[PDB]
Amino acid sequence: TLISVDYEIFGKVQGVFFRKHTQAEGKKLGLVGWVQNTDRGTVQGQLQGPISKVRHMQEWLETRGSPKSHIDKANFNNEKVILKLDYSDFQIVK
């Protein structure tokens, strides 16, 4: 079963190479989607892939992040089953 879920990560999450590490971890886990800095100092995006792989990523986003990050909170929402992927890679949105 494939799912899509949205995320936003709060904390010391900008200026700590969060997007680069997020993309690398997503790719390692066989996930597609995207990551983007927000105007409110957070990191946001969407993950898509097998449920099991998405859960691994969610733990990473709430627990680990990039080496220099400090994560205050990870909010997940809009989880939904999808019939096929909407993306073919894990992109950093400039």
Residue numbers in the entry: 5 to 98
Describing publication, verbatim:
Here we used a pair of thermophilic/mesophilic acylphosphatases homologues (acylphosphatase from hyperthermophilic archaeon Pyrococcus horikoshii (PhAcP) and human common-type acylphosphatase (HuAcP)) as a model to study how local flexibility of the active site affects the enzymatic activity. Despite remarkable conservation of sequence and structure at the active site, the catalytic activity of the thermophilic PhAcP is significantly poorer as compared with its mesophilic homologue HuAcP at low temperatures. The salt-bridge between the active-site residue Arg-20 and the C-terminal carboxyl group is found only in thermophilic PhAcP but not in mesophilic HuAcP. Taken together, our data suggest that the presence of the salt-bridge between the C-terminal carboxyl group and the active-site arginine residue increases the activation energy that results in a stronger temperature dependency of the enzymatic activity.
Importantly, the activation energy (52.5±2.5 kJmol−1) for HuG99 was analogous to that for PhWT (49.1±1.4 kJmol−1), while the activation energy for HuA99 (29.5±1.9 kJmol−1) and HuWT (37.6±3.1 kJmol−1) was comparable to that for PhG91A (32.1±1.7 kJmol−1). To provide further insights into how the active-site salt-bridge affected the enzymatic activity of acylphosphatases, we calculated and summarized the free energy (ΔG#), enthalpy (ΔH#), and entropy (ΔS#) of activation, as well as the changes of these parameters (ΔΔG#, ΔΔH#, ΔΔS#) upon the removal of the active-site salt-bridge. The values of ΔΔH# and TΔΔS# for HuWT were somewhat lower than those for HuA99.
